[PDB]
Amino acid sequence: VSFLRTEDMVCLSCTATGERVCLAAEGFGNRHCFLENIPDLSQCVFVIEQALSVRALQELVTSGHRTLLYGNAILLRHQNSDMYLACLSTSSSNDKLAFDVGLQQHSQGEACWWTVHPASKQRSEGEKVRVGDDLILVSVATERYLHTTKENDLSVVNASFHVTHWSVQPYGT
Ligand SMILES: [Mg+2]
């Protein structure tokens, strides 16, 4: 029916212990991402600011109203905070092999870029991303999946070598 585009406003959602949740962030404090179970969800809103071939991404690190192709690297701006969904440098509590995921105060480097990949055989690289598709998000910097799981039953969010499927839902009409 409909295709993901740059400048679109979205929530990222997954199923955590049966429940539906969205990837949320605050913009102050530690700025670590977190999950809110689903006007009253503003911190769960990201803007797809840029999408590029990884060739272009690597070119730039040394757009428009454009449609997302699987394999694209995308730049996700947190609306409230004007910051960017990023892979952090510090390691996750309860998995030494994961990285924390939070907000980075600027849009520089690779830690704020995520490649998009099919969460099923029903799609292949280079195809248009459809609203409603389930996504796999791989950090460009640390080659880990944006991933969600629990520790002492508390759904946490990190970048690790285990995969989560995310569903990109549009915000607003
Ligand atoms: Mg900005």
**Neighbouring C-alpha atoms within 13 Å toward the C-beta of 22:** 19
The domain spans of the chain are 1-173
Are 78 and 46 spatial neighbours (Cβ–Cβ below 8 Å)? Answer: yes
Burial class (CB in 10 A: 0-12, 13-18, 19+), 119: middle
95 CA distance to ligand 1 middle (Å): 31
Centre of ligand 1 from the C-alpha of residue 25, in Å: 16
Is residue 30 classed as helix, strand or coil in its secondary structure? coil
Distance CA 79, CA 65 (A): 17
First to last CA, the chain: 15
Distance 123 CA to ligand 1 centre (A): 32
Structure tokens, 47: 């803007």
Contact 75, 47 (CB under 8 A): no
The upper half-sphere exposure of residue 56, i.e. CA atoms within 13 Å in the direction of its Cβ, equals 12
Amino acid symbol at 96: K
Length of the chain as a residue count: 173
- Specify the resolution in Å: 2.5
Residue 72 CB burial class (10 angstroms; 0-12, 13-18, ≥19): buried
Ligand 1 centre distance from Cα of residue 148 (Å)? 26
Query: In terms of Cα–Cα distance, which of 33, 30, 2, 36 is closest to 16?
Result: 36
17 C-alpha to center of ligand 1: Å? Answer: 34
- Give the determination technique: X-ray
